[PDB]
Amino acid sequence: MVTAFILMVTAAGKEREVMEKLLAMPEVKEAYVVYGEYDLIVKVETDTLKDLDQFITEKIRKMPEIQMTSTMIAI
Amino acid sequence: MVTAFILMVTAAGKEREVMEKLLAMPEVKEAYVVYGEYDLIVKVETDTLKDLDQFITEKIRKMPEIQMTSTMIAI
Amino acid sequence: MVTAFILMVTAAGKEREVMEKLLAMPEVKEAYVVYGEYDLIVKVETDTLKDLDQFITEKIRKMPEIQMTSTMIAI
Amino acid sequence: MVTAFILMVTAAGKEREVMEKLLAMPEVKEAYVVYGEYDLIVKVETDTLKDLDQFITEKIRKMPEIQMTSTMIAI
Amino acid sequence: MVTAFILMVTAAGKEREVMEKLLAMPEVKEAYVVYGEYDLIVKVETDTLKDLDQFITEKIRKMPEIQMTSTMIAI
Amino acid sequence: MVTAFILMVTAAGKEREVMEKLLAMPEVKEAYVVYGEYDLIVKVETDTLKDLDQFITEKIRKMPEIQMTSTMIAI
Amino acid sequence: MVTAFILMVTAAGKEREVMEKLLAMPEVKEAYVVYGEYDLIVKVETDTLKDLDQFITEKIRKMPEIQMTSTMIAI
Amino acid sequence: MVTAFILMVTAAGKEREVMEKLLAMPEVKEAYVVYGEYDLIVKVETDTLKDLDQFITEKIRKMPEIQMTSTMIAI
Numbered sequence A, B, C, D, E, F, G, H: 001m002v003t004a005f006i007l008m009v010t011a012a013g014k015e016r017e018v019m020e021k022l023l024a025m026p027e028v029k030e031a032y033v034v035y036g037e038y039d040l041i042v043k044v045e046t047d048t049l050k051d052l053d054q055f056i057t058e059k060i061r062k063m064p065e066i067q068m069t070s071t072m073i074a075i
């Protein structure tokens, strides 16, 4: 499987709204609101790299509340 | 007790109105518009880390004029 | 001749449409959506540095979906 | 006098519009479009620090086309 | 309790032997070698901020292999 | 009066002793050891910008335990 | 197939000789010495992500002249 | 001709003796010690990019005092 950590910036007053969307997703294993330039860090897992590609470009990046993301694929 | 400094980037031209809004908050002890990568520096004091957590999420991150923050907790 | 790579951050969910627009440009030889702080990596080739200058100002910086770039010129 | 360099990010397709505003200002000594995360770097001079404070918060930061700025005051 | 994610850059080729050391530390809940600007990411859990800062300056910053860290405290 | 905040990085284990030297300077109004990127945040005040330049370049920067400083002048 | 771009920082004066070693690897499709933050930009391809992990951690990162790498996997 | 601005961080307390050296270099058109993340900013002018990269790796990166540079080529 593929494990990845996604750092996210959400629109103001929407970080909780996004967390609630994420915590209902099978791929999300853990999610936290964090201090700093990023609002959240999310740990996700997919069977294949191709599924991760789809998840992030279709589910995450298309979420109206998300303004930016930086994903760190784990070895 | 918790003392922390929050450096923040605000929308160009909104730094002063944002500062006035923050200065009105009890948790805020000092606030200055500054030159550099950051536009505002705010000093806050809260009873607990949890209160600091909530100041960041329920107050700072709900203000659309604030774009990026960096929090440094006194230790 | 000039060869350069432009790494760019785009609005969440716009990376692919931006890429298709760039791929249509003659100066663009390759373009990939990538994981990490950047969302797109583009390889361009122009006759002169001045042409590279104009590609950045008249094309890249006029596209509202592109937010931040970093250009590395081959040497 | 006070000398400072201002790094600026402008709205897409407005960097030239901003340059034209800047090149008509007495305080601007030189201005350039630059590669990178910033669109322009501008060298300004004011008689006093107080005048710089006014110039940047009133003229620069209030310019509708400007999204962010980072000023480096010179010694 | 204090939960935090620490992003680290390590001496090239030393990332794994460093991770082993980290996974040995009780404060470390999970550790991964990652792709991107950072090479490692660990999720730490301490009882107090004091213990967290103490953990970094004693076990993290003391490891020669580790060249740079960025800490995001979870809320 | 010129007010400024200095973010300082000091040689490890010297944070406390450096702060005590700073607290002894009449230019220093506040000094805090903090957690994170920077080791210290210091609030200073001088009558003129000329004095601030001299104070930082001749005193602060000459302190052997201080490695980096990022001064943010206030409006 | 997995395609990725590696941004590399090498010990000064070793950029050219490192590139020639890279160009000799069948995983490497393109390599360029560039101006700026990074010294080299390298395009690589492998059949699986597992192979990429192995290639970067066992070959790339073990090269003595390579100091830092930031790999950006493509979608 | 190629015009570029180089931002540098220097060993604390060495910024001025370093600047003197820079002002001695013919490629250097102006140099200032600045407040902020960077300590120095120089405006360089060379005939070719080749000469610019050569200027940094020969005169800039070779100075021990200089710890970090960021280059913005002017368009």
Ligand code: MET
Pocket: A006, A056, A057, A061, A069, A070, A071, A072, C015, C033, C034, C035, C036, C037, C038, C039, G075
């Ligand atoms: C892979 S879609 C755009 C990628 C983005 N930079 C991220 O890592 O989230």
Ligand code: MET
Pocket: B015, B033, B034, B035, B036, B037, B038, B039, D006, D056, D057, D061, D069, D070, D071, D072, F075
């Ligand atoms: C001094 S108004 C806001 C300051 C901003 N960070 C700048 O240096 O341009």
Ligand code: MET
Pocket: A075, E015, E033, E034, E035, E036, E037, E038, E039, G006, G053, G056, G057, G061, G069, G070, G071, G072
């Ligand atoms: C995979 S070992 C360290 C990886 C490094 N951060 C890179 O992305 O190149």
Ligand code: MET
Pocket: D075, F006, F053, F056, F057, F061, F069, F070, F071, F072, H015, H033, H034, H035, H036, H037, H038, H039
């Ligand atoms: C004024 S000497 C170097 C100044 C440093 N960049 C600072 O802002 O603290």
